[PDB]
């Protein structure tokens, strides 16, 4: 579609659990430009595109946000 | 204010309850400002949510925009036809079913079209509701089957019999005058027999109160009934001798009525007696002196009348024949001469 849909917008929508409030062309553009997928059949409905976008976003997310609020031995650190 | 706010209407239109869209359309149509851009949106919403929507609201929405946009009203009625038929069949209270049949008959008559099953159900219900039927209710119910070309012979005969020439104090003024016109027009549209007595008593009771121009329409019906019902002939005589026509002879209220009267009078052969001559001659002279060219329906009616008069060899009055020739040249000048 156009340039208003960016990584920040999709990330916010994903974190608020409201990804389905988007049109099919928007999701297709996001997958074809941001996620850099090979090609998408211009026939898939909302569910397949949403699942693909969601899996790609979760797989490439590797910055842990949780902080362990517990004590644990066997951990070696040199700080 | 409405003109300024209207462009916002098309933006927030598909979020309105039907019970408020009714008042929206009433306000927009009472000032002739309503446009055909939000009407289609409201119609789409109503036809989409026809599964569960109060029938009163659907009837109101179908009736309100029937005058200007008929197709949307037709689609709205077709969306809830089956539910309306089931409601009009299974219901018990007389008042609500009476109001429903009257309103649906009015909608069908206004739109000049009607579904088959709904008309059948309305027919049987109107048969079951015979006692509470006011004369205007019967008039409108029979009018609905007119302007729609739907035949219910049992309904026609039964309602004509149940009319029974029962008038308020037997001196009805207008409660069965338009009803009389509807009756004769319907029985002429779907020709039948056995109604001679009802027809003649109704004509006798209505000619005294038929001062309206609808009498002319009745005349047409009467001549259109002369082919198969000879017994109507005296009533036409009464219709040719009523006080309203005596008053109309002096001044022609409507020239279209003058043309239709001339056609009916010619087809009835009423150009022989001296009274008939004294009636026709003012009309022909008025048509000759009528300013401007005749209207399309009007010029067609006078063309048919003059063709019939030329085919009518009974016209022996030389002054009348000369006047007919004058109308001939006047119509030719309207047509190019």
């Amino acid at each position: 579609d156009f340039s208003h849909i960016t990584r920040n917008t999709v990330w916010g929508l994903w974190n608020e659990g409201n990804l389905f409030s988007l049109s099919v062309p928007e999701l297709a553009f996001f997958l074809q430009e941001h996620c850099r997928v090979a090609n998408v059949d211009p026939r898939a409905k909302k569910s397949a595109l949403v699942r693909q976008v969601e899996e790609i976003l979760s797989a490439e997310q590797q910055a842990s946000a949780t902080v362990p609020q517990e004590d644990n031995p066997h951990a070696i650190v040199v700080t | 204010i409405v003109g300024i706010l209207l462009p916002r209407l098309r933006e927030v239109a598909p979020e309105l309850i039907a019970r408020e869209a009714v008042h929206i359309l009433r306000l927009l149509c009472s000032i002739q400002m309503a446009d055909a851009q939000l009407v289609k949106v409201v119609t789409e919403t109503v036809v989409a949510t026809a599964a569960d929507v109060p029938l009163r609201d659907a009837r109101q929405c179908a009736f309100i925009l029937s005058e200007t946009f008929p197709e949307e009203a037709q689609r709205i009625l077709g969306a809830v036809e089956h539910r309306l038929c089931d409601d009009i069949d299974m219901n018990a209270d007389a008042n609500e079913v009476k109001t429903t049949i009257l309103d649906v008959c009015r909608v069908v008559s206004a739109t000049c079209k009607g579904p088959r099953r709904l008309l059948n159900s309305v027919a049987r219900r109107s048969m079951e509701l015979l006692p509470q039927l006011t004369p205007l209710d019967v008039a409108f119910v029979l009018k609905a089957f007119h302007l729609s070309s739907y035949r219910h012979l049992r309904l026609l005969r039964v309602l004509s019999s149940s009319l029974a020439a029962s008038f308020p104090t037997s001196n009805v003024t207008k409660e069965h005058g338009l009803a009389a016109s509807i009756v004769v027009q319907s029985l002429a549209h779907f020709y039948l027999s056995g109604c001679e007595e009802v027809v003649v008593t109704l004509v006798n009771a209505s000619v005294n109160v038929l001062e309206g121009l609808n009498l002319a329409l009745t005349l047409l019906a009467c001549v259109r009934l002369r082919c198969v019902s000879p017994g109507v002939d005296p009533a036409v005589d009464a219709l040719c001798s009523g006080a309203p026509m005596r008053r109309y002879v002096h001044n022609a209220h409507s020239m279209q009525v003058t043309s239709r009267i001339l056609y009916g009078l010619a087809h009835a052969g009423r150009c022989r007696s001296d009274e008939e001559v004294a009636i026709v001659l003012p009309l022909l002279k008025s048509v000759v002196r009528t300013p401007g060219a005749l209207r399309d329906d009007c010029r067609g009616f006078l063309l048919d009348a003059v063709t019939a008069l030329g085919a009518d060899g009974e016209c022996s009055n030389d002054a009348l024949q000369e006047q007919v020739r004058k109308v001939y040249e006047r119509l030719s000048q309207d047509g190019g001469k």
Binding site: N8, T9, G12, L13, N15, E16, G17, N18, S21 | -
Partner: protein, 37 residues
């Protein structure tokens, strides 16, 4: 009020409460971290 209301289905143990919130993160004001001097 149909469908054997007197036979409640066995409720699976793998059900944790979930909430749906819309517009929590979206907005021009809540767009980027800020700083002051």
């Amino acid at each position: 009020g149909y469908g054997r209301w007197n036979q409640a289905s066995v409720m699976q143990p793998e059900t944790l409460l979930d909430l749906s919130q819309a517009g929590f993160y979206e907005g021009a004001a809540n767009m980027v971290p800020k700083a002051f001097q």
